[PDB]
Structures are given as C-alpha cells and as structure tokens.
C-alpha cells in the first residue's frame, strides 16, 4: 500500500529509533507504536530502523534484528515483515549511492529474518530473477551467502558473558 505523509512519519520516527539504539529497548518501540496506530504505514518503522542502522556501526545493525523479532507477534504480523522488506529493497537504490556497503548489509538483514523465522524462506525464490535491479539482486545474493554460514553455528553465537 501507499504510505500517506511519508516525510512527516520519517521525521517523527527519527528520535524514536535513535533512543532505541542506545540501550536496546524493544518494548519502548512497541509501546510507542500502539500510540501512533498505523496500518500499511506500519511497515515503515522496521524499514527506517534498518536504514539508520546502515549509517551507524555494525554493532547497531545486529541489534536491529532483535527489534524485528520482538515486534513480530506483538505489534507486527509475520506477513507485515515481508512487505517491509519489499519497501526497503525499493529504497536500497537511493542509500546505496552514499554507502556502497549498504546492499551488503541488507543481505544480512534478510538472512537473519529468515533464519530466525520472521520472514518467509521462499522470499528469495520469489525474487529469483524476477528483479530488474542489480542493487536489490546483490542483497538477495548475500542472503544465501550469509545463511549458509551461521546455519551450522546458530547456537554458538551467544555464549560469552562479560557485561
């Protein structure tokens, strides 16, 4: 669906997401989301959270997937996440210009979403050549590239305690 008042929404979500990356409060986002109350524009939130994380350090990116998994089931349907990825992919061509590493990161976001179960697995198959954008295609490539990596070491990523 077409998002009404796009910029007005972006500017409002700016501090919301910013404050999130500070200590990682997934509950804060949801609580505020219900306050705003959005329909098709709801996919905007997960998208922006992704775009900003591209500018920030990689540490801030890995933390983005946490928000997604938390949001889904609580304030976002599994089916809503899918739409968010499409919306993001369409934006990719723009951000890719300033950050050349942007698409490479995007692939990780897709891979993680599928790996945990917040995005459909056949999502990549559905876009299996049915894409006229090379920027969007690379993101789809890395998705498998990275999925093939942590597929075996999924339960060995979190075993260090020193915080």
């Amino acid at each position: 669906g077409l998002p009404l008042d796009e910029r007005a929404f972006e500017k409002t979500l700016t501090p919301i997401i910013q404050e999130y990356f500070e200590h990682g409060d997934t509950n804060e986002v949801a609580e505020m989301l219900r306050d705003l109350n959005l329909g098709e524009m709801k996919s905007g939130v997960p998208v922006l959270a992704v775009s900003l994380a591209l500018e920030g350090k990689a540490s801030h990116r890995e933390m983005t997937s946490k928000l997604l998994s938390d949001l889904c089931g609580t304030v976002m349907s599994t089916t809503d996440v899918e739409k968010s990825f499409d919306k993001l992919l369409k934006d990719l061509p723009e951000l890719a210009l300033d950050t050349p590493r942007a698409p490479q990161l995007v692939g990780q976001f897709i891979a993680r979403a599928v790996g945990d179960g917040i995005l459909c697995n056949t999502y990549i198959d559905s876009y299996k050549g049915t894409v006229d954008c090379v920027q969007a295609r690379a993101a789809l490539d890395k998705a498998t590239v990275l999925l093939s990596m942590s597929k075996g070491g999924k339960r060995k990523d979190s075993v260090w305690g020193s915080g």
Binding site: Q104, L146, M149, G153, S162
Partner: protein
C-alpha cells in the same frame, strides 16, 4: 550490565570465502580484509583459500581463488611472511589430506608454480614444496 563480548574467528573468516564463492567480487573482499586491524592475522585466509581449491572440484575455484590472493597482493594487502606461513602449513596438511598416494601433486605443483611465476613468493618457499 552491558552487551555481550565481540565474537572472533566465527562469522569472520567464513565471510571472506562465502563472498568470493557466491558473489565473486574482488572489492567486496578487499574492503572486508581491510576491515581487520591485524595484518599479521591475514595468513589465516591465505591458508584457507589454498585448502579450498584442494577440497573443491571444478575449475571455477582455481580460476577465482588464485585471483583472490593476487588481487590482494596488488595493493599490498598480504605480507610475504604471512603468505610464507600460509604455504608452510599446507605442506604439512598435504599428507593428512591425501593420506597416502598424493594424486593432488599435480594441483599442488601447478598452484605453487603459478604463484612463483607471478612473483609473489621467492624460491625459498618453492624449495619447501615437494618437487
């Protein structure tokens, strides 16, 4: 009170191989190797890339694998010391991988032969190769 410590080795060395395998881009790997602060640790990929060709069937590997190191050597990314130890470990793994009757001698020789010809390693390393 804080976040979990940064991971190491895992989700690090593997990335280099995967990126070159499916995608197959020099610059993609370039920026990634440049990401690491430790240049001395650059020997790990060196060794791994050599192991791949020995464990992978197809010219696709040998064509893109050697190109990977040579590409890194283009801008002085890999050090001779690092490349030296990378090959030395291979000469040790050879008997373990082959386990009697090394039919991979053809690959081993040609690979080192090309490397020497490329001018990235001197005769000293070639002398360590079972010629």
């Amino acid at each position: 009170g804080g976040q979990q410590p940064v991971n190491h080795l895992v989700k690090e060395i593997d990335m280099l191989l995967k990126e070159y395998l499916l995608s197959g881009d020099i610059s993609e790997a370039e920026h990634c190797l440049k990401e690491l602060e430790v240049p001395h640790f650059h020997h790990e990929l060196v060794y791994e890339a050599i192991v791949m060709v020995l464990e992978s069937t197809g010219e696709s590997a040998f064509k893109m694998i050697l190109d990977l190191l040579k590409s890194l050597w283009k801008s002085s990314t890999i050090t001779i010391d690092q490349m030296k130890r990378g090959y030395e470990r291979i000469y040790n793994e050879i008997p373990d991988i082959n386990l009697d009757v090394p039919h991979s001698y053809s690959v081993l020789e040609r690979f080192v032969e090309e490397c020497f010809q490329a001018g990235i390693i001197s005769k000293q390393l070639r002398d360590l190769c079972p010629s």
